[PDB]
Design an enzyme around this catalytic site. Structure first.
Site, PDB file in Angstrom:
ATOM      1  N   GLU C 171       0.823  -1.201   0.000  1.00 22.72           N
ATOM      2  CA  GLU C 171       0.000   0.000   0.000  1.00 22.72           C
ATOM      3  C   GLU C 171       0.865   1.262   0.000  1.00 22.72           C
ATOM      4  O   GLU C 171       0.299   2.362  -0.223  1.00 22.72           O
ATOM      5  CB  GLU C 171      -1.095   0.102   1.043  1.00 22.72           C
ATOM      6  N   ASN C 255      -0.282  -7.947  -4.095  1.00 24.74           N
ATOM      7  CA  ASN C 255      -0.845  -7.044  -5.084  1.00 24.74           C
ATOM      8  C   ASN C 255       0.196  -6.064  -5.593  1.00 24.74           C
ATOM      9  O   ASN C 255       1.155  -5.729  -4.878  1.00 24.74           O
ATOM     10  CB  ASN C 255      -2.124  -6.388  -4.464  1.00 24.74           C
ATOM     11  N   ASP C 297      -6.934  -5.114  -5.896  1.00 30.66           N
ATOM     12  CA  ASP C 297      -6.245  -5.350  -4.648  1.00 30.66           C
ATOM     13  C   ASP C 297      -6.482  -6.805  -4.209  1.00 30.66           C
ATOM     14  O   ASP C 297      -6.555  -6.979  -2.980  1.00 30.66           O
ATOM     15  CB  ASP C 297      -6.683  -4.396  -3.548  1.00 30.66           C
TER      16      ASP C 297
HETATM   17  O1  LIG Z   1       0.076  -5.312   0.637  1.00 29.91           O
HETATM   18  C1  LIG Z   1       0.490  -5.451   1.808  1.00 29.91           C
HETATM   19  O2  LIG Z   1       1.731  -5.378   1.931  1.00 29.91           O
HETATM   20  C2  LIG Z   1      -0.368  -5.794   2.883  1.00 29.91           C
HETATM   21  C3  LIG Z   1      -0.012  -6.089   4.179  1.00 29.91           C
HETATM   22  C4  LIG Z   1      -0.948  -6.505   5.125  1.00 29.91           C
HETATM   23  C5  LIG Z   1      -0.542  -6.733   6.439  1.00 29.91           C
HETATM   24  O3  LIG Z   1       0.688  -6.903   6.603  1.00 29.91           O
HETATM   25  O4  LIG Z   1      -1.239  -6.728   7.438  1.00 29.91           O
HETATM   26  C6  LIG Z   1      -2.283  -6.635   4.755  1.00 29.91           C
HETATM   27  C7  LIG Z   1      -2.524  -6.314   3.385  1.00 29.91           C
HETATM   28  N1  LIG Z   1      -1.629  -5.918   2.474  1.00 29.91           N
HETATM   29  C8  LIG Z   1      -3.818  -6.439   2.852  1.00 29.91           C
HETATM   30  O5  LIG Z   1      -3.995  -6.163   1.504  1.00 29.91           O
HETATM   31  C9  LIG Z   1      -4.890  -6.849   3.617  1.00 29.91           C
HETATM   32  O6  LIG Z   1      -6.137  -6.955   3.004  1.00 29.91           O
HETATM   33  C10 LIG Z   1      -4.663  -7.101   4.996  1.00 29.91           C
HETATM   34  C11 LIG Z   1      -5.482  -7.520   5.978  1.00 29.91           C
HETATM   35  C12 LIG Z   1      -4.736  -7.663   7.114  1.00 29.91           C
HETATM   36  C13 LIG Z   1      -5.159  -8.119   8.381  1.00 29.91           C
HETATM   37  O7  LIG Z   1      -4.380  -8.738   9.121  1.00 29.91           O
HETATM   38  O8  LIG Z   1      -6.366  -8.007   8.652  1.00 29.91           O
HETATM   39  N2  LIG Z   1      -3.454  -7.424   6.869  1.00 29.91           N
HETATM   40  C14 LIG Z   1      -3.396  -7.035   5.554  1.00 29.91           C
HETATM   41 CA   LIG Z   2      -2.174  -4.995   0.253  1.00 31.58          CA
END
Ligand SMILES: O=C(O)c1cc(C(=O)O)c2c(n1)C(=O)C(=O)c1cc(C(=O)O)[nH]c1-2
Ligand SMILES: [Ca+2]
Ligand SMILES: O=C(O)c1cc(C(=O)O)c2c(n1)C(=O)C(=O)c1cc(C(=O)O)[nH]c1-2
Ligand SMILES: [Ca+2]
Lengths: 69, 571, 571, 69
Positions: C171, C255, C297
């Site tokens: 992100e 992503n 995403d």
């Molecule tokens: O693209 C990323 O690097 C990244 C990291 C993480 C994360 O580390 O928690 C999540 C996400 N994306 C993500 O897209 C996501 O929907 C998400 C949900 C969560 C969570 O633990 O609820 N972490 C993350």
């Molecule tokens: Ca992500």
């Protein structure tokens, strides 16, 4: 100072051996600031008027509001 | 009120923090008993989503449960028909500075209920009444002002159409008063200060008439040099009791300010005193000062327990209380006569004893505090031999089950100014376990007492202070939560342990019990804090920090961490 | 390593977050079965003293249990002989600004174990190896840099003498990579990036030799325009799997960045790829890009499950996986051959289907995203039909029990600049329940699948997303935690609910199990947070806030509050 | 753009109707700053150096210490 020597009933305080009987003028004088002392009173006066202001602007409408003024 | 009277008269409800008007903190519920207890199991739980000290216990009114948290003092209403749903919640918007003018954790001892409203306060000094079914705010007033170091922490008390509230802050030099409001509209009725003129203090013309040697008129100022009483302390942040017959309510006033004794010569009246005041006018009927000229921070706010017991084989209306000073007191709740005044533990050394004739503690100089002198091995410590916990009473065997601390200190005062809104302690301490523990290490005990003899039937030692209290249920059990995280059930007869359960965090409140669809449940808060957990809660490493408390509770850290919530148990 | 394999082979131990090398997240313990599950009760509890989502599950090695919390990533060691005491604890010192770069709550998926070491990471980029017995740090190295938007959240993975760890931050334009470290020294072995040159992506000489159509060489540069791959995303923050016979490790890269598809024309390889890489060299043997040029995403980091099952009668070494995109995938783990590519729910509309011959998704233009356009009724949403949950597999019935989400969205991108250390999303979304729930408000499902056909045996609906996963225990039960706060047990046969307990808070991790002195236990973290709970843990109200999530979980507050802890259950 | 028309294996991207084949110079040109784009590499580089100093620093003494220079 054992608590048994009472000047008057309910007043049994005594200075400890080596200590002033009266604090003022001594090295243990608090030297309190009058205006500082009255701070609590002023505070209550204010807040009290706020609540009369709050409850009054409600006995008349029928609907209570805190954010009064 | 009639509404509270209704709740108080309903089996299985729990509308009063202390258990009832008399504050015996017990229950006739006997579905769980000594033969059963081993099978009690967790039924459900709830997190408040706030950390820090979780004091008090929830209220049960009908099929509704009311839970409260530490600062920011949120309120959650749950229908017992489905604990999973939060019917209404009240979540205040409070300034974060409030926290900095609070001496012993951002605690909250609970809710009160009256006239179908939930009476609740906020640390920042607001007091409110909310509908109990919708949570709509009926009225909101200001009781205290944090800018002069004054905050709310005790539970409101309700009797007839009156709510009693007292601000906290003696460590910031706040002048204590019990405030009375109209249940229905929140308008101030009267205010009764702990220091000042007879008019501010509100003594009736018959004040102490039965015990003139206790003191009467004008002590409010003569027992003080100059205007020192103006920032004299005496705040009431403890518990109340009420006698509907007599129409008198009782409570203790706190410590004089600053902690530095040499800065305030005098008896420092009417701080550290047990009161008997008319509920309607707030005028004092009797008042007995337990610790004239405090030198140890024994804030005299502990619970008042009203019983009807035989004294010399005659039935007498008693008032009982274990003070921070380490003396168990029994008085006649009618006129204030001194019946019992005994040491809760032989370790107590500030006083040789309390003379029932002079009604005064016979002070021991070796254990006093003064400028240019460091007092050592003073017992009890400032944390006292009894603090904020609510103890129970078994009406059948006539036993009080007390949660006591076994902690002593080192004390040396120092001079400092007074700035409205800043701390005013003026002492440096070191705290450590008292001497009678079986390994010289224990800091807590559950001790059972006879209130008319002041004698102990049995003792159960605990590693850490028994801070929260005890509850007594007719099934023959004494229920309590510990700082290290367990809820235990002891056999009232001998204090032997029948059951326990490891909660997320140590407990600083007292258990409560209620009935729902014919089933008895035991409720307990969890989330350690209060004075004992300040090192753990603020990350203090300095032994002297946290008013000397940090050193004492160094090991708590290896037994529990912060938490915040409720656990309910049942068969 | 050798020590790890010892624990792996000791009954009732739990040394891998995922259940074993194969990540089936199941267990042979059969003490608790469909016939006595009703009798399970809470055994003990422990609070972490931290708030925010508590993802992952504890580790059990011998008679020790290691628990972890949300940021700031504390570790607690407990001897099962005495849960009341904290043998050792590790509490990092981390800058609060770390939180500002974590996209989706300040979560931590757990610890790892190898060579008598507990391996733990910190959100801020460090990775350490601590004695499992004493907590003494053996080595501590930097993995990610919070200054460019890179943080750590996933559980480290140990295999042989190496520890795999990847940073988070797509992100914020972070270019993903799997980092391999020496178990004994913490020295870097190699790093395999998800974008750029084949040398950086570390492709073997025979990469995709069995499926040339998947693409081979030069695509991590060629499927982007210019240098866009440098901030191309593809972070792997999910789960890993390992085949010891084959010496391959598997995982999905995330992503591509930004979310604004128009700003990165190209298939954007090798983001959204399932990998088969050599453990010792880290060279990819095969690579399957599930989602060329992601427009939603659908981060492809979900759990990889290895199973050995017959396909058309031939026992085959398989890899199964449910992606955010809503597709259940089954491949041959040796060669990357695609066998199943099926919808986990008929509501999937971004693709008409996945062509097994072309091996790519047949896109439906009606549900694409693109500049100057608002796409509506897109299923699945960014949150996916499946997220970070850890699912379970029953080797006997040969069924996978999946916790799915049933959320769709509206989306429209917007142009934005890239500045290192700052968010790089560029999209506004609104998310809401999918169309198939019984009352059309349900956003979660427990769905039982056949991995060789991708057909559902049964479905269980849940009000809220099934975010944490499930556990399968030989007694014939599927165990899971809900966001509203219950741990549940179902009949693996028909998904019927046999038991439940209300925990203090929502659970976002997957349940675990172990043996101790002949009794099987069930452990579950509690404390809502993660993406679903950001509205609640951060107090957002804007429905659009929290990347679209807030509007979707607005009612979660009426069922739960934050928490932080572990609850252990048993008979 | 259905995903089925490939230029070469593993490369099946197509511009959507009305969108440019190449972004550079269009209304959708990201106009990325090279100085920004190189940050991650520089950071990694620096990190690698520090870490390498640590394992060496303790491979020679036998006592891990993070603080290095
Ligand atoms: O693209 C990323 O690097 C990244 C990291 C993480 C994360 O580390 O928690 C999540 C996400 N994306 C993500 O897209 C996501 O929907 C998400 C949900 C969560 C969570 O633990 O609820 N972490 C993350
Ligand atoms: Ca992500
Ligand atoms: O002087 C005061 O006004 C005041 C207030 C409070 C409080 O409200 O918590 C405590 C005390 N004193 C105090 O002396 C004390 O030992 C104490 C313990 C605790 C606690 O909640 O555990 N509060 C307080
Ligand atoms: Ca005090």
């Amino acid at each position: 100072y054992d608590g048994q020597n009472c000047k008057e009933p309910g007043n049994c305080w005594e200075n400890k051996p080596g200590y002033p009987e009266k604090i003022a003028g001594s090295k243990y004088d608090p030297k309190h600031d009058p205006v500082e002392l009255n701070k609590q009173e002023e505070s209550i006066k204010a807040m009290d008027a706020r609540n009369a202001k709050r409850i009054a602007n409600a006995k008349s409408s029928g609907n209570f509001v805190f954010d009064v003024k | 009120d009639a509404d509270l009277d209704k709740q108080v008269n309903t089996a299985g409800a729990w509308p009063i923090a202390t258990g009832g008007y008399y504050s015996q903190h017990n229950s006739p519920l006997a579905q769980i008993n000594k033969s059963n207890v081993k099978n009690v199991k967790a039924a459900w739980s709830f997190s408040t989503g706030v950390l820090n000290g979780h004091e008090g216990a929830p209220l049960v009114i009908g099929d509704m449960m009311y839970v409260h948290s530490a600062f920011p003092n949120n309120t959650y209403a749950l229908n017992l028909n489905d604990p999973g749903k939060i019917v209404w919640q009240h979540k205040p918007k409070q300034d974060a500075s409030t926290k900095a003018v609070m001496c012993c954790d951002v605690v909250d001892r609970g809710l009160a209920y009256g006239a179908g409203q939930i009476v609740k306060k906020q640390a920042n000094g607001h007091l409110l009444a909310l509908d109990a079914k919708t949570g709509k705010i009926n009225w909101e007033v200001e009781v205290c002002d944090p800018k002069v170091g004054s905050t709310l922490t005790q539970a409101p008390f309700v009797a007839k159409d009156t709510v009693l509230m007292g601000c906290s802050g003696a460590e910031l030099g706040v002048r204590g008063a019990v405030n009375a409001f109209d249940l229905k509209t929140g308008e101030l009725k009267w205010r009764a200060f702990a220091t000042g003129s007879d008019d501010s203090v509100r003594l009736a013309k018959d004040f102490n008439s039965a015990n003139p040697h206790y003191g009467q008129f004008g002590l409010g100022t003569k027992t003080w040099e100059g205007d020192a009483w103006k920032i004299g302390g005496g705040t009431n942040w403890g518990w109340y009791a009420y006698d509907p017959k007599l129409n008198l309510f009782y409570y203790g006033s706190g410590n004089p300010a600053p902690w530095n004794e040499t800065m305030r010569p005098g008896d420092n009246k009417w701080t550290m005193t047990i009161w008997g005041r008319d509920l309607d006018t707030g005028m004092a009927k009797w008042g007995y000062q337990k610790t004239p000229h405090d030198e140890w921070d024994f804030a005299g706010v502990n619970q008042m327990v009203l019983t009807d017991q035989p004294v010399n084989g005659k039935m007498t209306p008693l008032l009982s209380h274990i003070d921070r000073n380490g003396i168990l007191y029994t008085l006649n709740r009618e006129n204030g006569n001194l019946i019992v005044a005994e040491k809760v533990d032989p370790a107590v050394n500030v006083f040789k004893k309390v003379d029932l004739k002079t009604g005064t503690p016979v002070r021991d100089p070796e254990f006093a505090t003064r400028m240019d002198h460091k007092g050592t091995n003073i017992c009890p410590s400032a944390m006292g031999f009894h603090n904020q916990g609510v103890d129970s009473y078994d009406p059948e065997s006539r036993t009080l089950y007390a949660g006591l601390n076994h902690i002593c200190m080192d004390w040396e005062p120092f001079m400092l100014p007074y700035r409205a809104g800043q701390f005013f302690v003026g002492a440096t301490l070191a705290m450590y376990p008292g001497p009678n523990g079986p390994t010289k290490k224990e800091m807590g005990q559950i001790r059972a007492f006879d209130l008319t003899t002041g004698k102990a039937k049995w003792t159960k030692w605990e590693k850490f202070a028994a801070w929260g209290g005890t509850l007594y249920t007719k099934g023959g059990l004494v229920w309590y939560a510990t700082l290290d995280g367990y809820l235990k059930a002891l056999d009232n007869k001998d204090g032997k342990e029948l059951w326990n359960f490891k909660m997320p965090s140590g407990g600083i409140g007292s258990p409560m019990t209620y009935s729902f669809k014919g089933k008895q449940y035991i409720g307990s808060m969890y989330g350690v804090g209060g004075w004992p957990g300040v090192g753990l809660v603020f990350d203090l490493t300095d032994p002297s920090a946290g008013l000397g408390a940090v050193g004492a509770f160094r090991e708590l850290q290896n037994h529990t961490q912060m938490g915040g919530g409720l656990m309910v148990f049942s068969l």
